């Protein structure tokens, strides 16, 4: 995947109204209507659009897009950078939320989900789940056969592929 390749994939990832919205923000920093903005304003536009890159991350991006020393970033490269950041932030959010889901499921906080805690949470959903169904989930998820689900096994169970 080349940069233009990366650019077509960034556009395919977003709806067109989202892309127009992003450009509406981006254009407020252009001025010259060149289709580019100063690398010094990249962090500001990304934050305005809900992203939270670290300073180290911004420096890395700038270094990747400004090799000719023009001091600018164009809109197509900006979309690539936005999509990279959106993917990283969403995965961060998903990991944090799974850690909270686990602390909640583990009622006695012993660091493991046991069959009684698993059945209680599945039954509370209102679904017509049977004890066989709960036991089936426990066996398929308990990779070391200790009768319980630890956090590593919980992440694998939930992410599935995982």
Cα separations in angstroms, 77 against 10, 39, 61, 73:
9, 11, 10, 7
- The reply, when asked if residue 140 is annotated as ligand binding, is no
Resolution in A: 1.8
Locate tokens 């979309």: which residue? Answer: 79
- The reply, when asked if residue 106 is annotated as ligand binding, is yes
Handedness of CA 72, 78, 36, 29 (dihedral sign): negative
CA-to-CA distance for 82 and 51, rounded, in angstroms? 8
Among 73, 90, 107, identify where a domain stops.
Answer: 90
Same domain, 10 and 72: yes
DSSP 21-76: HHHHHHHTTT-S-SSEEEGGGHHHHHHHTT----HHHHHHHHHHH-TTS--EEEHH
DSSP β-ladder status, 36-38 and 72-74: antiparallel
- The reply, when asked if residue 30 is annotated as ligand binding, is yes
CATH number at residue 43: 1.10.238.10
Are the C-beta atoms of residues 158 and 122 closer than 8 Å to each other? no
Locate tokens 């000719």: which residue? Answer: 68
Residue 107: give the domain boundaries: 91-162
- The reply, when asked if residue 153 is annotated as ligand binding, is yes
- The reply, when asked if residue 97 is annotated as ligand binding, is no
Same domain, 16 and 78: yes
Q: How many domains does the chain have?
A: 2
Q: 39: Cβ–Cβ under 8 A, 6 or more apart, which residues?
A: 62, 65, 66, 71, 72, 73
Same domain, 9 and 62: yes
- The reply, when asked if residue 108 is annotated as ligand binding, is yes
Structure solved using which method?
X-ray
Same domain, 125 and 63: no
Among 42, 57, 90, identify where a domain stops.
Answer: 90
- The reply, when asked if residue 120 is annotated as ligand binding, is no
């Amino acid at each position: 995947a080349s940069m233009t390749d990366q650019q077509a994939e960034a556009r395919a990832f977003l709806s067109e109204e989202m892309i127009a919205e992003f450009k509406a923000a981006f254009d407020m920093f252009d001025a010259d209507g060149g289709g580019d903005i100063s690398t010094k304003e990249l962090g500001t536009v990304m934050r305005m659009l809900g992203q939270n890159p670290t300073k180290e991350e911004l420096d890395a991006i700038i270094e990747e897009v400004d090799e000719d020393g023009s001091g600018t970033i164009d809109f197509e490269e900006f979309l690539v950078m936005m999509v990279r950041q959106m993917k990283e932030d969403a995965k961060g959010k998903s990991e944090e939320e799974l850690a909270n889901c686990f602390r909640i499921f583990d009622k006695n906080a012993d660091g493991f989900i046991d069959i009684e805690e698993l059945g209680e949470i599945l039954r509370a959903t209102g679904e017509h789940v049977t004890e066989e169904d709960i036991e089936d989930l426990m066996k398929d998820s308990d990779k070391n056969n200790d009768g319980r689900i630890d956090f590593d096994e919980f992440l694998k169970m939930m992410e599935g592929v995982q």
